[PDB]
Amino acid sequence: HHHHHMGQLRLAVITTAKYFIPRLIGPFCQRYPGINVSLKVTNHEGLINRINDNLDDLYVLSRPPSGFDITVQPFLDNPLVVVGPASHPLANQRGISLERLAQEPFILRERGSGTREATEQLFAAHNLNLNVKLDLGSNEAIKQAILGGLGLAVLSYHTLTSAGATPELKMFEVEGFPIHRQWHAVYPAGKQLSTVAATFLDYLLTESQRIAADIQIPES
Amino acid sequence: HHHHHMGQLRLAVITTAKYFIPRLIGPFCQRYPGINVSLKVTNHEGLINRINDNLDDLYVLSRPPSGFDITVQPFLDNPLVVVGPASHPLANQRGISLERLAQEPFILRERGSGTREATEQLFAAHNLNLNVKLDLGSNEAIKQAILGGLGLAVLSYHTLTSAGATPELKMFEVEGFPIHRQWHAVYPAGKQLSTVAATFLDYLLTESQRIAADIQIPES
Ligand SMILES: O=C(COP(=O)(O)O)[C@H](O)[C@H](O)COP(=O)(O)O
């Protein structure tokens, strides 16, 4: 091992993408051991500020931002799904109706959050009331709250793929889910990508569908 | 239908406490269904602001803050430890020196993090240069990077697992580790705790000493 790294890769990704980006960083760093990587993980507001200040090589976001000279490339599905404990009575039920589901307590992200609005918007179309027991601003906090028995959640499928994930939390088979959403690679269009970043972007675009199969992203 | 405990409970905790606090709310609410609980998860600057504005009943942080009239209750040790993959050559080695550890690449959190600054200060105290090859802003990313073979990390004990996931990490026996850090519940001392807050605090102390007993080892 060497102390000085002839090249650097600066990434900033939306919080939920923390479960997926390291699956690329790992094999990339094994191929190019002379690179040091910096990875920032933050919400949409944080990422916009970093783009505004031009801090990183590459950004991973859900929705492409307005007001910036950027190139945007979709690369991966981010489906939102119903999550609960494996011990829940509905855990193994097939085709759970949205009515049987609405009578369940939920732990969701804050109002105005992407996942929260999707389930609220969906619950509006069937004129049903969503029973919100607790509002948490963190994927990890929500999953901890589920295993404490406080109810079910709507989370991105990628929160189920933590390293060493166990069958203790599981995706529920529910009508109207998964709700399709996408992740995009974003970078400033005014300046050319560095060689390291361009090499990583190509890897991300060519390698992500292999990983999508290995973690079994639902195409639903 | 006789609930002796009804009230409002407002909690605010430092980010790392998302790994132990939200899972406790579940059984607490199952025991006291008449208590309405809100939980805010934020960083140190955010938490300090909330204490200043008197927004919550109880606050969970590591080091007690300066400049506030507060009562402080210790409740859980969350020590910092060296972790690597089980297949690493050092995995089963006894009494690894910091010199020996310093030849390895490290995967750490960003600057300003508790784990990063503790590790930088310790290695500086032995005039050792820490090879931080990957600076990753997420424990989940760090754990994947470890399992990918990219090197070693420093994490707090309760971050070594996550809700529904037990990655195959191994704690290394290393001189200068574990670095003890104590977590505290704090509340303004000018006002008596509300009945519900005192009930939650008593619960938090009882369940944390349960966790402490479960991992107890001989100390000096
Ligand atoms: O911004 C967040 C949101 O929390 P969450 O990931 O729980 O949605 C976290 O700081 C990073 O994601 C890293 O979290 P971690 O160190 O736990 O991986």
Swiss-Prot record, chains A, B:
Principal location: cytoplasm
Keywords, alphabetical: Activator, Cytoplasm, DNA-binding, Transcription, Transcription regulation
Physiological role: Activates transcription of the cmpABCD operon under carbon dioxide-limited conditions.
GO molecular function: DNA-binding transcription factor activity; transcription cis-regulatory region binding
Protein name: HTH-type transcriptional activator CmpR
Record carries keyword Transcription regulation: yes
Residue span relative to the full protein: 94 to 307 of 323
Family: Belongs to the LysR transcriptional regulatory family.
Entry's Gene Ontology cellular component terms: cytoplasm
Subcellular locations according to the entry: Cytoplasm
